From a paper:
Whereas traditional therapeutic antibodies have been limited to extracellular antigens, T cell receptor mimic (TCRm) antibodies can target intracellular antigens presented by cell surface major histocompatibility complex (MHC) proteins. We previously engineered and described a TCRm that detects an HLA-A*02-presented peptide derived from alpha fetoprotein (AFP). AFP is a biomarker for hepatocellular carcinoma (HCC), the fourth leading cause of global cancer deaths with a mortality rate of almost 100%14. In prior work, this TCRm displayed high specificity and showed no evidence of off-target recognition.
We also determined the crystallographic structures of the unbound TCRm and AFP/HLA-A*02 complex. Although the resolutions of these structures were lower than that of the complex, electron density was clear enough to show that, in contrast with many TCR-pMHC interactions, there were no large conformational changes seen in either molecule outside of changes in side chain rotamers, small rigid body shifts of the TCRm variable domains, and slight remodeling of CDR1H. The rigid interaction between TCRm and AFP/HLA-A*02 likely further contributes to high specificity and affinity, as more flexible interactions between TCRs and their ligands have been associated with higher degrees of cross-reactivity.
Author numbering:
A (entry chain C): 1 to 9
B (entry chain B): 1 to 100
C (entry chain A): 2 to 276
Amino acid sequence: FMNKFIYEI
Amino acid sequence: MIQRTPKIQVYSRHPAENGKSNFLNCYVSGFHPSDIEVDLLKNGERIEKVEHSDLSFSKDWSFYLLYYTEFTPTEKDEYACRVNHVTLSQPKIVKWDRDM
Amino acid sequence: GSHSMRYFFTSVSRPGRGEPRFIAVGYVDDTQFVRFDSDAASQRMEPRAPWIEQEGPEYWDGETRKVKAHSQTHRVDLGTLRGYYNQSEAGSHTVQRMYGCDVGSDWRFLRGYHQYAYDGKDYIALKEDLRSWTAADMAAQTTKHKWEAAHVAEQLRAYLEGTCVEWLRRYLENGKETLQRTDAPKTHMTHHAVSDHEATLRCWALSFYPAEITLTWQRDGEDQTQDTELVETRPAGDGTFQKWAAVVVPSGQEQRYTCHVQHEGLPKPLTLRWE
């Protein structure tokens, strides 16, 4: 199960 | 940018026995960047149906791939793996040894 | 025992050649179970394990909806990083992300990690306290400030200490036949004649899981690791692993050499001797 939220560099 | 040389291992899934089916593996590891060309060879000729694992990396961000294909080893047949990468000035051929 | 769930992501820009290559793989311990490849046809999360395919359509829909978000984030990151380092538009660059959680023997949270690298070099990493960041240079420090402002580490802590552990426990329960197993290595020793005065003694360990194993040669008890050809532990292709260690023995001294095999699946370390 992957993380629902992914922020950018 | 970072360039790491691929370590190549040519081997079989099971101990080699003539006449019995097996899998030939070419395991490239510790290379960077991910652009790599890996071909499995039978008597110098390219084997067509070769499947490969999915691209993953290690603690130092160096990639590892496994190429494999079914084959039946014999006493006279010769198998090898050709690997081409930026870090290799010449595409390297690694012969398959039954005891390696 | 110690178990772990890890996700690996690789985004490789292909300038003037199409969309960036995005590859995502998921591991429980040394077992791959999920994969996504932008160059595959499905454009979905595909199973790679027999214990994971029995998940419902909701699971795969959510996994594909999240991996496409990861893909879009990495495509934006490629340009942002090309800007931070003032690199040209015609070079192919690599972004790598790895995050996951390890749980202990009690199946409770033990360690979380979230690392991010650019061109095979560490860029930014979550520290062990899951609160602070380790930056590699000043662009990574800029990212560190952008992420501290957005409270990224708090959300990541909530995921790694909660969701990650829960789904890892689910996987361990549903796939215990492959995940909670310990395949002891099948060991044997070979002897080859490189000349009439020298020989090669090779010690093999095959069909073992997990991949952690120690093969040590000894001459009359003293360590021989400096004169030992050891190869990296390699996958066999069937979910097990292989390894071997070779030593150059002077002909007539084979009885002085002993191979030692240490693995989680062995109750006692195996001591192999030629003759």
